[PDB]
Design a protein around this ligand. Structure first.
Ligand code: HEM
Ligand code: HEM
Ligand SMILES: Cc1cc(N)nc(CCc2cncc(C3CCN(C)CC3)c2)c1
Ligand SMILES: Cc1cc(N)nc(CCc2cncc(C3CCN(C)CC3)c2)c1
Ligand SMILES: C[C@H](O)[C@H](O)[C@H]1CNc2nc(N)[nH]c(=O)c2N1
Ligand SMILES: C[C@H](O)[C@H](O)[C@H]1CNc2nc(N)[nH]c(=O)c2N1
Ligand SMILES: [Zn+2]
Lengths: 413, 408
């Protein structure tokens, strides 16, 4: 592969140069003959597979702290090696675990908010053994990160995978989501995207309120055991009711959303070690709620109803009634959140900060992998600076990875 | 491998087999994806390519291996052998052009692919000849507002020294002027080209919407300036249906979108000059042309006339101005009976087209980065549609700007 790759920004003519891609550790899905950049998703490690993976991580850790080739470095290599040989695995030091987590985020090519990658509170939950313990750890995470609306980014990391039959898993794909209920007539109540999961919860014993915005319980799996249900204390779930700075009628739509975006279904990979339960959270970009959650057809789909109250001609598409309503919904979301002093970032600010971040990363690190398809906001694309920014995508490690839904893989006891 | 693509909104899955046919590169590797990078012959090189195209041609008319096929293969071989090139049959020229459109992964308008009027200009020898051919193109394709897709194909490349080139990147564009006080009049993207015309004898009206002259190079010679007759250049005054003040902004645009800087490749032959034209998707003008910072950059002005609170980004004043500006463009074109499509309709049609292609062709190369409209992304169906990108020939390729390679 070429040593230097150049990326251009077409708005500003700025050309950046990328050397970091050479450290790419895995497959993107693309080949020389086909590109899969718009494809969403394109058993344990052996002693022999694990050795080089850990050395790679450790070397990079000691390289980061400016102690490469030092005594401490070679001792750590020797200690890890002995440990893998004797136990078929190894344990990270707390310093290494934190470094690993921050760099997983730093390496997340699909994340527009990485400017903050080094401010991340890491909670080490590797001493956890039961689902009840997972519940305590998770509640503690929610409260710390919510911080009465002044959100703080954080991750809680459960014990790594051992044999594969003892994984810890949060079954919710996000810590806080709303329930979805399929009706006999085929209409859905709540968030239609979570019908399947809601049904599992009800099967497992959940008593469903059957409202529009019901916070789902946690479904938590410890040490390969069957999952257990817990209700997050309502007082820990910060919520924001959506109103509009102009249309007094907007609050009549009865809309609200949760303040904490917290992904819980991904697998954290550090130095060959797999952390299958690693809930992490930041704060929302407005479009996530105002465009995707509210206006996707297979989601809350409020476009028509908002358009009606906006009194818009809705017979033609070329009136751009959808577009017009979309803007207002997003003005509302950003407005309601700022008013309740709950941290949120609009897509203009977020994308600008990312360009600054990206430029700094080329400077100091020699690149910054980014997935354009995800970075570019789902509205007003070309009026944000990232639309014009050429990006290179590649997978560096440590990383956050997708993994199978656990209800497909679980062996019930 | 058979490859699957899912739409996430409808959960529809299509199966891609067509991709097994490509030989050209995409730019990506197993380890690096360049999906957002804009720009990622002899007797021995030329024949297999020729063979492939002719083969795929006869395969498409259901006469593969025929006597017609075999002789054509023989004919083409003897010709490359003795002349270091070959000429396409007329039937082959049309097919080749239609399929280069059909394979244009960055084009959302491909549902129209086979309704293409092809003008053979391979008999052209001079820039005057070129100007005449292009004027006929503009007049036909413009058609008094009822636009018709077209392509005009000039002589192929021979030796690289005698190249046919249209120098303007598009047939119709507005001039851009560098002001004393640092600002810029007209289209800032065109300032260099605009300057090259002035440096060639173009007397510029120095307006905000001066149609540039044509700059045509024939057979490798110096290019020559020609003014398109104004009655052939249709334009549209932009007005808004509620904001009566909108017309006072003084905005117009041309009706004919016509790319002239690309290279059409067929059977290993290279047509360096092949202006092609369709009709506009509204966002092209409303979002990109009017509101890019490096372009006409009118968001601020419009937001002013709408009296929006422009202090913080989180008011989305920019987004608000954006939607209104686009409503006007669609409204104006529709009011002047000039063909235009809005991004909602174009994307629907494109998804429909994809379905067609998978069904009858086993796939459809598509560049998600380009297909997704530059505003209101995820409320158009293409946002949620996974696309596979790969390079099929015949194809439209980029080429260097002529002012960087030309020996005057
Ligand atoms: C601090 C403020 C943050 C902001 C503003 C932000 C912004 C975003 C946005 C808008 C997305 C796209 C989400 C979607 O479309 O579903 C995203 C994805 C992602 N973020 Fe960030 N994020 C933040 C914090 C974090 C943190 C703390 C982590 C991990 C430690 C993280 C890792 C990721 C990953 C791995 C994805 C891809 C998720 C997926 O593929 O489903 N982000 N981020
Ligand atoms: C008939 C109606 C058509 C519509 C509505 C349409 C739509 C579009 C749009 C919106 C773009 C993006 C342009 C940009 O962002 O600069 C595009 C690009 C493109 N179109 Fe189409 N198009 C049409 C006809 C055609 C025709 C007739 C051809 C060829 C004969 C064609 C081939 C291409 C190619 C090669 C590109 C990419 C150009 C580049 O890479 O700069 N399209 N089309
Ligand atoms: C760390 C982090 C930060 C941030 N701004 N957003 C996220 C995603 C949060 C999120 C919350 N609930 C639901 C989702 C869904 C939205 C719809 N997608 C299809 C799947 C993920 C995503 C994560
Ligand atoms: C065949 C065709 C159809 C269509 N609807 N649009 C196009 C693009 C036409 C077009 C016309 N003038 C100017 C441009 C520029 C706009 C700014 N871009 C950065 C480069 C291309 C593009 C081509
Ligand atoms: C098909 C396409 O890859 C898919 O719809 C992607 C597009 N870009 C996205 N971008 C973000 N931020 N989040 C998403 O879920 C998606 N979905
Ligand atoms: C860097 C990026 O590839 C560049 O901004 C692209 C993005 N997508 C685009 N999409 C279209 N339709 N037209 C364009 O000119 C571009 N520019
Ligand atoms: Zn790729």
């Amino acid at each position: 592969c070429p040593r230097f790759l150049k990326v251009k920004n077409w708005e500003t003519e700025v050309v950046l140069t990328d050397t970091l891609h050479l450290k790419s550790t895995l497959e993107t899905g693309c080949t020389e003959y086909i590109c899969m950049g718009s494809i969403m998703h394109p058993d344990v490690a052996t002693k022999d597979q694990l050795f080089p993976l850990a050395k790679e991580f450790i070397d990079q850790y000691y390289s980061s702290i400016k102690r490469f080739g030092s005594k401490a470095h070679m001792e750590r290599l020797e200690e890890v090696n002995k440990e893998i040989d004797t136990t078929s695995t190894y344990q990270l030091k707390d310093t290494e675990l934190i470094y690993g987590a921050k760099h997983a985020w730093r390496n997340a090519s699909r994340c527009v908010g990485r400017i903050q990658w080094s401010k991340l509170q890491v909670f080490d939950a590797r001493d956890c053994t039961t689902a009840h313990g997972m519940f305590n750890y998770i509640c503690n995470h929610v409260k710390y990160a919510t911080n009465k609306g002044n959100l703080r980014s954080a991750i809680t990391i459960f014990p790594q995978r051992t044999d594969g039959k003892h994984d810890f898993r949060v079954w919710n794909s996000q810590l806080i989501r709303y329930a979805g209920y399929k009706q006999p007539d085929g209409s859905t109540l709540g968030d239609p995207a979570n019908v399947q999961f809601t049904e599992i919860c009800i099967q497992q014993g959940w008593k469903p309120p059957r409202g529009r915005f019901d916070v789902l319980p946690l479904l938590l799996q410890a040490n390969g055991n069957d999952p257990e249900l817990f209700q997050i204390p309502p007082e820990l779930v910060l919520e924001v009711p959506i109103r509009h700075p102009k249309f007094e009628w907007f609050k009549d739509l009865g809309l609200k959303w949760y303040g904490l975006p917290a992904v819980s279904n991904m697998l954290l990979e550090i130095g060959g070690l797999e952390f299958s339960a690693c809930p992490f959270s930041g704060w929302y970009m407005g479009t996530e709620i105002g465009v995707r959650d509210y206006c996707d057809n297979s989601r809350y789909n409020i476009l028509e109803e908002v358009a009606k109250k906006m009194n818009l001609d809705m017979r033609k598409t070329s009136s751009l009634w959808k577009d017009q309503a979309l803007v207002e919904i997003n003005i509302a979301v950003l407005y309601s959140f700022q008013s309740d002093k709950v941290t949120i970032v609009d897509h203009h600010s977020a994308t600008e900060s990312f360009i600054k971040h990206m430029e700094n990363e080329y400077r100091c690190r020699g690149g910054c992998p980014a997935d354009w398809v995800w970075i570019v906001p789902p509205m007003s694309g070309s009026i944000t600076p990232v639309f014009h920014q050429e990006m290179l995508n590649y997978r560096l490690t440590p990383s956050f990875e997708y993994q199978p839904d656990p209800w497909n893989t679980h062996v019930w006891k």
